């Protein structure tokens, strides 16, 4: 099913995962249908975790 | 267009249907043209598609109306793709992909209790499923007057093609249980895409305006008594007041009763009286729900005018605009059918050949309304809106010279005794591919010295088809913006893969420093004395 989301998320909703860096819960959370918020109230256990997950991958290189 | 060259797209998107579709039971299409009053074809698979471009709003505002079904067929059945019903290739993907297609669009539409103009029986069936799951719900019954769902399953029930995910799809809403979700919330089918729609439009951008219709052709049997006497005036208000409680996304509420004269269909009703009635109803709703709503997010109310001189009259819009009246609609549009007539004519058009033949429908045009509504009512231009269909209309045993018909012949068109759409008679009839405005198969275009409009013609026993073209829409929008307009409107939105709406936007003057293009197929076609029927009896 997940590709559901994938094609209008990313279609128009969202350019990627690591703009999900700009939210708050609540302004999150406003913005869904059923077919999200019935299988969405997960989402920012791991992908806030997603948006500082590229932290150090330009940093760790500092030799 | 001196002389220069343009060149076709080598495919016109090409998904599934149409090269199955050729041999189905009743597509009797041939290119040369015939009586077969049925054929399916769809519209992805002589499709140009969509291109964006600077959408800065102030202009006459491009709208469409909508209605349900794509296969659209007198008595409908359940289930789909199998000729009773298809989808015509209309997923709703195409406009979830271009969300700043129309600054306006037109739903459609809700029922009235005791109204058998809707229909008398299966809505009424609806009406007696309130009337027995509501009380079950401690929910109150409704009197005539209110308004009611016309297909709960149809309407919230479904999910294929209204662009939502599989699972969405709920079995539970027939007639016994269904009142528990008729509200915004509860949102599914079309009334979840539309929802989604505005939503989306917002979110890369700017806005959508979303109005509604009541009523139609067929359907204006209970306005008169609706309007006649308060006590079902006061049902129906408090309905609306209902309606935008549990659905507040909609911006518009428009009765289209047809006509303040009397009109349309022996099912309607009317008393001279009605047309005097009709403005007591809106001044009535529009205090009501100036009342329930405020003025910063007030509801719109706008009227179908008629585009025929003497009914404009009786339409008493120079009452309408001392009582309340955002807009007005120009519907000058069905000034030709293929049955009615006695002679081949055309849907409309900008300019009459002089005159109005026999004192018929034929041989009007849109020039004439505006000349009288501006100054003989006194009406804004910024109030009117044009009114457009996005289909052609046929006619068979034709000559040009004296308009003669075969007096009972229903000529082929898509659907089942309705109109040719033109991807189907570009597929067929017409060049949009090598730089000249022509027939191809056998079939020619003709433009009318008189009139100026263009047809398609063929030389067989007849076959003659009244047509729109990319170079006529490309004009109506220069037209129609120089011509002051509050809008001008599509009918219905389901009928262009991008032919002719396209040419809309270029039209109206929207811009990007494309799909295709057309300069050389902006020429016109053969130049006939399509003589008025006053220039035949001459």
Redesign the interface.
Same mark, same amino acid.
């Given at each position: 099913?997940s590709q #559901?989301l994938a094609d209008?998320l990313l &279609?128009? &909703?969202y350019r990627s995962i690591f703009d999900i860096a700009k939210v708050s819960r609540q302004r999150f959370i406003k913005?869904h249908?059923? #077919?999200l918020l019935g299988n969405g109230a997960v989402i920012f256990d791991k992908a806030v975790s997603m948006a500082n997950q590229v932290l150090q991958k330009y940093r760790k290189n500092r030799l | 267009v001196k002389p220069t060259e343009n060149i076709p797209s080598p495919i016109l998107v090409e998904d599934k249907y149409t090269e199955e579709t050729y041999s189905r039971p009743d597509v009797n299409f041939k290119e040369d043209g015939s009586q077969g009053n049925l054929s399916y074809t769809a519209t992805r698979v002589c499709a140009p598609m969509y291109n964006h471009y600077v959408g800065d709003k102030t202009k006459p505002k491009l709208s469409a109306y909508i209605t349900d079904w794509c296969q659209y067929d007198a008595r409908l059945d359940g289930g789909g793709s199998k000729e009773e019903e298809r989808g015509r290739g209309f997923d709703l993907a195409t406009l979830?992909?271009n %969300?700043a297609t129309y600054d306006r669009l037109i739903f459609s539409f809700l029922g009235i209790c005791g109204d058998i103009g809707n229909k008398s029986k299966k809505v009424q069936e609806v009406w007696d499923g309130w009337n027995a799951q509501a009380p079950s719900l401690g929910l109150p019954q409704i009197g005539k007057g209110h308004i009611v769902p016309l297909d709960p399953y149809g309407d919230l029930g479904t999910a294929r093609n209204v662009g939502? %995910? %599989?699972?969405?799809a709920d079995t539970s809403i027939e007639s016994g249980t269904f009142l528990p979700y008729y509200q915004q919330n509860r $949102?599914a089918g079309l009334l979840?895409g539309l929802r989604?729609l505005q !939503? !989306?439009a917002h $979110?890369?951008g700017h806005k959508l305006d979303l109005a509604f219709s009541i009523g139609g052709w067929s359907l204006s049997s209970y306005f008169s008594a609706l309007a006649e006497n308060p006590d079902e005036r006061r049902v129906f208000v408090a309905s609306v007041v209902d309606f935008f409680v549990r659905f507040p996304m909609f911006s518009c509420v428009d009765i289209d009763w047809e006509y303040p004269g009397g009109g349309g269909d022996e099912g309607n009703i009317s008393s001279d009286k009605d047309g005097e009635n009709y403005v007591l109803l809106i001044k009535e709703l529009r205090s009501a729900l100036d009342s329930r709503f405020g003025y910063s997010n007030r509801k719109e109310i706008s009227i179908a005018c008629s585009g025929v001189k003497a009914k404009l009259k009786k339409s008493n819009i120079d009452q309408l605009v001392a009582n309340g009246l955002d807009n007005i609609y120009l519907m000058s549009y069905d000034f030709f059918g293929t049955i009615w007539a006695d002679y081949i004519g055309h849907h409309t058009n900008l300019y009459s050949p002089k005159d109005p033949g026999e004192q018929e429908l034929f041989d009007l045009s849109a020039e004439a309304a505006i000349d009288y509504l501006h100054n003989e009512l006194g009406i804004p231009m910024e109030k009117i809106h044009l009114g457009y269909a996005n289909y052609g209309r046929s006619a068979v045993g034709g000559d040009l010279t004296t308009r003669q018909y075969t007096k009972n012949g229903p000529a082929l068109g898509t659907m089942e005794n309705g109109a040719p759409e033109f991807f189907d008679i570009v597929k067929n009839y017409m060049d949009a591919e090598h730089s000249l405005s022509m027939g191809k198969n056998g079939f020619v275009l003709m433009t009318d010295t008189n009139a100026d409009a263009d047809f398609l013609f063929s030389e067989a026993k007849g076959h003659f088809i009244s047509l729109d073209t990319p170079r006529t829409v490309k004009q109506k929008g220069e037209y129609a913006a120089k011509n002051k307009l509050g809008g001008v409107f599509s009918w219905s939105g389901d009928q262009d893969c991008g032919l002719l709406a396209n040419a809309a936007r270029e039209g109206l003057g929207y811009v990007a420093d494309e799909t295709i293009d057309m300069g050389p197929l902006y020429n016109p076609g053969k130049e006939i004395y399509l003589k008025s029927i006053s220039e035949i009896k001459s």
């Open positions: 099913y #559901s209008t &279609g128009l &909703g913005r249908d059923e #077919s | 979830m992909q %969300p939502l %995910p %599989p699972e969405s $949102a979840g989604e !939503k !989306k $979110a890369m």
